[PDB]
């Protein structure tokens, strides 16, 4: 009850910044997550014993894949923490509760393959979930873990607050399907420019939380350049393995997943920053001005990829 998680001084200060890297010590990640729940939500939000059991079962249900792993989950939850702490008064107690959980859970049981590869392989998940295949799976794994004995961190909520939090988590997880982001961001851009954007409209908040989810999920592009560049290596290690698997099915992968296009990576990152990342953090900064450091760090990393192309790095 009188028990506070604390961090060494460098971590206690840097965890508050958007560009924080959670580090290579796996055994500190649970503590880092509880620290963030306690400060964004309160020591009162969850029973510590239930929360600890939930976190450890979530970790066990992430796989040892190069990118979509337990480190990615905690990284995406820290970006959410930074958004919530810089926009204190914009969010309900249930949103604060749900969104860090949604972030920790958003890629549960990922196998390192895209929705498109499950559909071409004809994986059973592709017949159970026709669109947002993995993202419906991640939400289904989150519910499974919440129903294990001693793992219901939400047991203090009413039937209706419980139904609301699971609905916030479901939408937040579904929104991490990047196929859905493009249309979400265009609707948000238009609503903001014509001044129709209204945070009392539930379906507007839903879209804003959707964009916050894309922003957290993409947050590797908002780190210090060596973090950005080394994470890119993990991202391609997956994509290229998927490319190999496409060739095994007799299918030319897209360029992004073809390891023979290794040399064009600097240019693929440019398209990605211009087509996806920069527009994501721009719209986010218009709607939530204190998230600007994410846009500023993304722009810095774009000009680092530009330098790689010019042969200056
Ligand atoms: C940093 C980051 N965070 C999240 C995600 C989902 N992604 N996806 C990419 C891939 C970006 C990309 N690379 C390529 N190619 C073309 C052939 C070669 F040049 C590589 N095309 N594209 C679009 N990087 C990220
Ligand atoms: Mg995902
Ligand atoms: Zn993710």
């Amino acid at each position: 009850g009188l028990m506070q998680f604390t961090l060494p001084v460098r971590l206690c200060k840097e965890i508050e910044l958007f560009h924080f890297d959670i580090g290579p010590f796996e055994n500190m990640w649970p503590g880092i997550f509880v620290y963030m729940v306690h400060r964004s939500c309160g020591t009162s939000c969850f029973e510590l014993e239930k929360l600890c059991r939930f976190i450890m079962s979530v970790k066990k249900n992430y796989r040892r894949v190069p990118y979509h792993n337990w480190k990615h989950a905690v990284t995406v939850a820290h970006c959410m923490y930074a958004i919530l702490q810089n926009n204190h008064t914009l969010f309900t107690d249930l949103e604060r509760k749900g969104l860090l959980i949604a972030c920790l859970c958003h890629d549960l049981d990922h196998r390192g393959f895209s929705n498109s590869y499950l559909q071409k392989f004809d994986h059973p998940l592709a017949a159970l979930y026709s669109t947002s295949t993995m993202e419906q799976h991640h939400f289904s794994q989150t519910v499974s873990i919440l129903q294990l004995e001693g793992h219901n961190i939400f047991s203090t909520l009413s039937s209706s607050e419980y139904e609301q939090v699971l609905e916030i988590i479901r939408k937040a997880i579904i929104a991490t399907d990047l196929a859905l982001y493009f249309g979400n961001r265009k609707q948000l851009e238009e609503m903001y420019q014509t001044g129709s954007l209204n945070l009392n409209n539930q379906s507007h908040r839903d879209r804003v939380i959707g964009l916050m989810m894309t922003a957290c999920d993409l947050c590797s592009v908002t780190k210090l350049w060596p973090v950005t560049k080394l994470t890119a290596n993990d991202i391609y290690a997956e994509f290229w393995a998927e490319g190999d698997e496409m060739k095994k099915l007799g299918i030319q992968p897209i360029p992004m997943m073809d390891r023979d296009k290794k040399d064009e990576v600097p240019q693929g990152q440019l398209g990605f920053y211009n087509a996806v990342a920069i527009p994501c953090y721009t719209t986010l900064t218009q709607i939530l001005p204190p998230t600007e450091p994410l846009l500023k760090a993304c722009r810095d990393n774009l000009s680092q990829w530009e330098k790689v192309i010019r042969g200056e790095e």
Side-chain angles (χ1 to χ4, degrees):
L2 306 159
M3 276 203 280
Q4 196 49 3
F5 276 75
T6 52
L7 303 174
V9 165
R10 187 195 67 86
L11 276 85
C12 168
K13 302 176 142 215
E14 255 121 289
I15 195 173
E16 293 310 314
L17 313 187
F18 284 101
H19 61 268
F20 183 57
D21 174 84
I22 61 174
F25 299 101
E26 302 216 332
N27 296 151
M28 283 180 78
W29 298 338
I32 285 168
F33 186 78
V34 171
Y35 182 83
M36 292 188 297
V37 172
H38 281 172
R39 275 187 107 258
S40 59
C41 201
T43 50
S44 44
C45 270
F46 308 108
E47 203 217 294
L48 189 58
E49 203 193 288
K50 280 170 180 304
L51 178 56
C52 285
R53 212 155 29 231
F54 181 85
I55 287 171
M56 294 321 285
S57 293
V58 180
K59 176 186 151 57
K60 186 210 275 127
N61 282 283
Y62 275 92
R63 306 199 167 207
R64 300 201 216 84
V65 295
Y67 179 72
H68 286 108
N69 53 43
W70 177 230
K71 189 169 199 174
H72 169 75
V74 178
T75 290
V76 168
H78 160 269
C79 191
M80 181 61 71
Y81 171 71
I83 296 178
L84 293 174
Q85 295 297 260
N86 282 267
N87 303 268
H88 173 57
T89 71
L90 287 203
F91 293 106
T92 76
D93 315 52
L94 279 183
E95 288 166 350
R96 260 186 276 90
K97 269 169 160 153
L99 283 176
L100 290 177
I101 295 298
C103 283
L104 196 71
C105 296
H106 80 286
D107 270 329
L108 259 167
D109 195 35
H110 206 285
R111 326 295 178 93
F113 295 107
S114 64
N115 287 341
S116 143
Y117 177 78
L118 267 76
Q119 291 141 31
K120 260 139 195 156
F121 182 81
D122 198 5
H123 187 287
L125 288 174
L128 182 42
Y129 312 118
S130 26
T131 69
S132 293
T133 301
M134 290 298 315
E135 291 81 20
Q136 299 195 61
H137 185 57
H138 311 310
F139 180 63
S140 162
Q141 292 280 290
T142 308
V143 169
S144 286
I145 284 170
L146 276 172
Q147 293 179 157
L148 298 169
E149 299 218 321
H151 289 57
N152 211 278
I153 58 169
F154 292 125
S155 67
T156 73
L157 301 199
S158 58
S159 320
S160 84
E161 287 187 312
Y162 185 99
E163 168 137 15
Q164 283 180 89
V165 84
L166 260 290
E167 197 64 4
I168 290 167
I169 291 161
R170 187 180 63 75
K171 288 163 185 167
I173 288 179
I174 298 306
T176 60
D177 176 9
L178 209 51
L180 298 179
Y181 144 76
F182 298 98
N184 187 53
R185 192 203 56 90
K186 282 158 197 156
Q187 296 285 115
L188 277 170
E189 200 208 312
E190 271 175 59
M191 284 162 195
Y192 170 80
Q193 279 168 6
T194 75
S196 40
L197 187 57
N198 179 20
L199 290 150
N200 295 333
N201 181 327
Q202 189 54 61
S203 89
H204 284 193
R205 297 181 79 68
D206 284 356
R207 302 203 163 274
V208 169
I209 294 159
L211 189 65
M212 292 163 54
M213 293 297 292
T214 304
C216 295
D217 202 5
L218 294 195
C219 74
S220 91
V221 305
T222 68
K223 302 302 183 188
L224 220 65
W225 168 246
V227 178
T228 302
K229 184 192 168 211
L230 291 168
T231 306
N233 296 337
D234 295 338
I235 293 172
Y236 286 107
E238 290 200 4
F239 287 170
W240 294 339
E242 173 169 335
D244 295 344
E245 289 308 323
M246 285 295 197
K247 291 170 196 186
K248 295 184 185 181
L249 291 175
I251 307 177
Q252 194 56 38
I254 62 179
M256 203 187 300
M257 292 183 181
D258 186 359
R259 63 175 78 252
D260 297 336
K261 268 72 182 260
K262 190 155 192 188
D263 299 346
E264 301 170 30
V265 159
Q267 196 63 47
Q269 287 294 307
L270 280 196
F272 188 77
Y273 275 64
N274 286 312
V276 182
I278 299 292
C280 176
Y281 294 116
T282 300
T283 302
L284 185 65
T285 301
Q286 297 175 173
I287 301 177
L288 305 170
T291 72
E292 200 195 332
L294 294 169
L295 173 50
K296 174 190 172 312
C298 180
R299 288 222 175 256
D300 283 340
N301 283 320
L302 169 51
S303 91
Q304 290 300 290
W305 289 109
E306 280 165 346
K307 290 172 148 82
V308 167
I309 282 145
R310 301 192 306 258
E312 307 165 21
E313 207 153 31

